A paper describes a structure:
Recently our laboratory has introduced a powerful mode of photochemistry into proteins, namely triplet energy transfer (EnT) photocatalysis, by developing an enantioselective [2 + 2] cyclase that relies on a genetically programmed benzophenone as a triplet sensitizer. Compared with benzophenones, thioxanthones have strong absorbance features that extend into the visible spectrum and are less susceptible to off-pathway processes that compromise EnT efficiency. Here, we develop engineered translation components to embed thioxanthone triplet sensitizers into proteins. This system enables the development of highly efficient and oxygen-tolerant photoenzymes that are powered by visible light and can achieve selective conversions that are beyond the reach of existing photocatalysts.
The resulting variant, VEnT1.0, shows appreciable levels of stereocontrol (85% e.e. for (+)-1a) and substantially improved activity compared with small-molecule thioxanthone as a sensitizer. To further improve enzyme performance, VEnT1.0 was subjected to three rounds of directed evolution. To gain further insights into the catalytic mechanism of VEnT1.3, crystal structures of apo-VEnT1.0 and apo-VEnT1.3 were solved at 1.5-Å and 1.8-Å resolution, respectively. The structures show that the mutations installed during evolution have resulted in a repositioning of the mTX sensitizer. The protein pocket extends the triplet lifetime in VEnT1.0 (τ2 = 6.9 µs) compared with free mTX (τ2 = 5.0 µs) under anaerobic conditions. Interestingly, the large fluorescence emission signal observed with free thioxanothone in aqueous buffer is substantially reduced in VEnT1.0 and VEnT1.3, suggesting that sensitizer confinement in a hydrophobic active site pocket facilitates intersystem crossing to the triplet state.
Numbering used by the authors: 2 to 309
Write the structure that this text describes.
C-alpha cells in the first residue's frame, strides 16, 4: 500500500479563475495564470504576479491577438532574459515580458501546419522548450480540446527558433517534464495523458529528437481528471498533480507506480512549482481557484532559468 503524507498547506492567494501556471522568475517574483477569466462572454485570460507576503494579485498581461483573447495555461522562465514562456490554449506559445508586452512565438509549425493551443511547457538544460498542446487550432479557429478525440500534440521549440511538432494523437496531453542525466544532458521526456491516467516517456536524443516512446507510469484514481502539472525534485522524483484525486503523486526516477502520495486539502490540484533553492512547493488548485504552498522532503530540481 502506497504510503501517504499529509503536510501542512498554507494559503498564498485566492480568487483566480482556473489558477494554474505557477512559476518563479530570475528575481524570485512569483506568477500564476488565470486562464478562464472572460470579458463580454469571451476568453480574456490573465497572467498575474502574486505578492507572497500579502497574496495581492497584480495583472501582468492580458494577452489578445487581433481581437481574440488568450487562455494562458502554463509557464516557464527563460535563462538568458527574465521573460516568461507561456503556453496559451488559444494563442499557442507566448513570450511574456514582466512589463506586460508579449509576442506570439509561432502561428505555424516547422512543417507549415497551423499551431495548436498549448497547455504546459518545460525547458531542458540546453534551452529547448517542450510543450503540450491539448487544444485544437489556435485562434482564429473555434476553441476545441482533445478530451475525447485524439488530436492533442507535442511540440519542441528549439534554441534555433524552430517550432517542431514531435508527436500527435494524444488524448488531452497535460503536464510535461524533462528528466536529465546527472551530467545535465537531457535524457527522458515525460508527458501526462490526462484522461487515460498514463504518463508517457521518450528518450531525448537531441533538440526536437525523441524516440523509444513507452508508457512510463500509471496515475491512480478513476475520478474525472488525472495527471495535470508535474515537476521533478532534486533526486529526479516526479511529483504529479492528480486533478480530481485530492493528491499529488510521487514517482521514483524510473516511473511505474507512485511510491508515495501527498494528500491535499482540496480535490483538484492543477499544477505545482518549487521555489528555487528551497523545499517549498507552490500548488494551484481548481476546487477553490487558489494557490497554496507546502514543504516537501528536499529541494526542487534546478530549473533552466537558474543555470548559467
Amino acid at each position: 500500500e502506497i504510503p501517504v503524507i499529509e503536510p501542512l498547506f498554507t494559503k498564498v492567494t485566492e480568487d483566480i479563475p482556473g489558477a494554474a501556471g505557477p512559476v518563479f522568475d530570475k528575481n524570485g517574483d512569483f506568477y500564476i495564470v488565470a486562464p478562464y477569466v472572460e470579458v463580454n462572454g469571451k476568453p480574456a485570460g490573465e497572467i498575474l504576479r502574486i505578492d507572497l507576503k500579502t497574496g495581492k494579485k497584480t495583472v501582468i498581461c492580458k494577452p489578445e491577438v487581433n481581437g481574440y483573447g488568450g487562455i494562458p495555461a502554463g509557464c516557464q522562465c527563460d535563462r538568458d532574459a527574465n521573460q516568461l514562456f507561456v503556453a496559451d490554449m488559444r494563442l499557442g506559445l507566448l513570450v511574456v515580458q514582466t512589463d506586460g508586452t508579449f509576442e506570439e512565438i509561432a502561428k505555424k509549425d516547422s512543417e507549415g501546419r497551423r499551431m495548436q493551443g498549448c497547455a504546459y511547457c518545460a525547458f531542458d538544460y540546453e534551452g529547448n522548450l517542450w510543450i503540450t498542446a491539448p487544444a485544437g487550432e489556435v485562434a482564429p479557429a473555434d476553441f476545441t480540446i482533445s478530451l475525447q478525440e485524439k488530436f492533442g500534440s507535442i511540440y519542441c521549440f528549439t534554441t534555433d527558433g524552430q517550432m517542431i511538432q514531435v508527436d500527435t494523437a494524444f488524448q488531452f496531453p497535460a503536464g510535461i517534464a524533462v528528466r536529465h542525466m546527472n551530467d545535465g544532458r537531457p535524457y527522458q521526456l515525460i508527458v501526462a495523458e490526462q484522461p487515460t491516467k498514463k504518463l508517457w516517456s521518450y528518450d531525448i536524443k537531441g533538440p526536437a529528437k525523441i524516440e523509444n516512446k513507452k508508457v512510463w507510469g500509471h496515475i491512480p484514481g478513476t475520478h474525472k481528471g488525472g495527471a495535470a502539472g508535474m515537476d521533478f525534485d532534486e533526486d529526479n522524483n516526479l511529483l504529479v498533480a492528480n486533478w480530481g484525486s485530492s493528491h499529488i503523486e510521487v514517482f521514483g526516477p524510473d516511473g511505474g507506480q507512485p511510491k508515495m502520495r501527498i494528500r491535499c486539502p482540496f480535490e483538484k490540484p492543477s499544477a505545482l512549482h518549487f521555489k528555487p533553492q528551497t523545499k517549498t512547493i507552490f500548488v494551484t488548485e481548481h476546487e477553490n481557484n487558489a494557490v497554496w504552498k507546502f514543504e516537501w522532503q528536499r529541494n526542487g530540481k534546478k530549473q533552466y532559468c537558474e543555470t548559467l
